[PDB]
């Protein structure tokens, strides 16, 4: 196949569903891929390891400087999530609704 063609799955979606047959319960998870390993020993055909997790993992690779003047936690969260290229579903609903000067 070629390792550099396998490396094209970086950042793609992953689904995991677990089902209990006796009761009918379920558990679901959605995530993204961030690292890929291509391995092989003793001349076999090889295998692949996919690593990743929740989309907040890809929000941890960009240290910077910035500041916010006279806003609340609602507006600051929206501004931060609007400047990233990661697509995510959000429920924005904090309890402290007052203005923070700096």
């Amino acid at each position: 196949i070629g390792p550099d063609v396998i490396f094209k799955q970086l950042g793609e979606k992953v689904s995991i569903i677990m089902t209990h047959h006796e009761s009918g319960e379920k558990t679901e998870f959605h995530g993204l891929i961030s690292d890929i390993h291509v391995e092989g020993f003793d001349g076999n055909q090889g295998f692949v390891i996919l690593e990743g997790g929740s989309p907040t993992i890809l929000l941890d690779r960009d240290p910077a400087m910035d500041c916010y003047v006279e806003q609340n936690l609602n507006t600051i969260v929206s501004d931060i999530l609007d400047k990233s290229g990661v697509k995510m579903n959000v429920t924005n609903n904090p309890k402290h609704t007052d203005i923070i000067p700096y």
């Binding site: 400087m65 500041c67 003047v69 006279e70 000067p101 700096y102």
Partner: protein
């Protein structure tokens, strides 16, 4: 929690809405794109009050827009900035005189209070403005001169 150390900035605004002598600065990471901070305190060599002086007892010299300042953070918290002092640099300084013989205090209109330590000439104290009112204490000659362009009243 992060830890912060002193930085350099530029004074932007002076008109504090709460009348407490605070200023607004602009940091170096805001230089290319623009921006400014909130109101922060300026520290002084002397400040307080008394019974005969209710407010503004001490040394009151608030910075002007365009000044280069040093900003510090109290308790190491980057959310608690304050101004510690001002700096002289290439764009606004002519340095010290020969043998460091001049010590002065000047405002933006041109008011001056000056001490000259050169005992081989120009030794004394001067208080004057740009219009031409002078009071000069001359130490080489032991004289006192008072000069007014228009009128001197006693």
């Amino acid at each position: 929690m992060p830890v912060a150390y002193p930085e350099m900035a530029r004074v932007v605004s002076n008109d504090d809405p709460k009348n407490q002598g605070r200023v607004k600065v602009q940091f170096m990471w805001q230089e290319v794109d623009g921006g400014e901070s909130y109101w922060m305190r300026v520290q002084s060599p002397d400040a307080g009050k008394s019974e005969q002086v209710a407010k503004n007892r001490g040394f009151v010299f608030i910075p002007e827009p365009g000044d280069l300042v040093m900003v510090g953070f109290e308790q190491g918290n980057p959310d608690r900035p304050y101004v510690t002092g001002s700096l002289f640099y290439k764009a606004n300084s002519e340095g010290a005189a020969t043998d460091n013989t001049v010590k002065s205090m000047r405002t933006r209109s041109g008011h001056t209070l000056e001490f000259k330590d050169d005992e081989g000439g120009d030794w004394g104290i001067t208080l004057r403005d740009i219009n031409g009112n002078v009071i000069h204490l001359n130490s080489k000659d032991k004289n006192i001169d008072i000069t007014a362009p228009e009128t001197i009243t006693l």
